Amino acid sequence: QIVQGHNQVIHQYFDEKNTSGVLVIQTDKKINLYGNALSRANTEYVPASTFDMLNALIGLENQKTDINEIFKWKGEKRLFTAWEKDMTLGEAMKLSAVPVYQELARRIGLDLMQKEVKRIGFGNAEIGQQVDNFWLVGPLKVTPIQEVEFVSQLAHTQLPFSEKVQANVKNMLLLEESNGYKIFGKTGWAMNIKSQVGWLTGWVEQPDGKIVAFALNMEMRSEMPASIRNELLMKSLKQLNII
């Protein structure tokens, strides 16, 4: 049941940021839509870094890597200085270090990747012929509703992967943690489109254990702070009494 939530206030929040966005909340097979551009909820977009969650699942499931492996930095200048080091898959997750996730995609290889993305049904499930950038520039696209369903299932260990793998990938995703409320998830930003999409997709684990999943999806400009996504998400979650 996908419905427009009580949206008068969150609408304003999106307006007051001069963006066009949607916030999708899933709380036990109720999905509510918020924001100032609700039609985004059913529009496919490149997932960008949010795909790392699925890449990691597939790689661990198929034993292409393990959570102790240290991915070596060979010495080349990377897009961010923070990425310029040896790191594990979990540290790569937190930093969204693309080269590590590209190295993992190339181990998985094109077939296995396509077969796994189709089995999971992630978005349009098209990865094309280039195994190491399909989630960055296309052709892979996915809706915000499809993303919230995906993270909700990960949070509940309901994806079609091993329980241990799912637990290991959840453990990589912790963003912030106060008042007994934990926020897990993954930002993404498809900086090269004709239109730049920003994601923050994840869930809240409330103190009593309950899970509320989210997927924020908005139009990004270069004028904006990267932090704008976390700011709009947290303001909205507070207004909705989810945190």
Automatic annotation (TrEMBL):
Chemical reaction(s) catalysed: a beta-lactam + H2O = a substituted beta-amino acid
Pfam families from the UniProt entry: Transpeptidase
Domain Penicillin-binding protein transpeptidase: 18-233
Keyword Coiled coil in annotation: no
Keyword terms, alphabetized: Antibiotic resistance, Hydrolase, Signal
Assigned protein family: Belongs to the class-D beta-lactamase family.
Any one GO CC term of the record: plasma membrane
Record's keyword annotation contains Signal: yes
EC number of this enzyme: 3.5.2.6
GO biological process, one term: cell wall organization
Gene Ontology MF annotations: beta-lactamase activity; penicillin binding
Top-level EC class as recorded in UniProt: hydrolase
InterPro entries tied to this protein: Beta-lactam/transpept (IPR050515), Beta-lactam/transpept-like (IPR012338), OXA-23/133 (IPR058235), PCN-bd_Tpept (IPR001460)
Domain of life: Bacteria
Protein name, as recorded: beta-lactamase
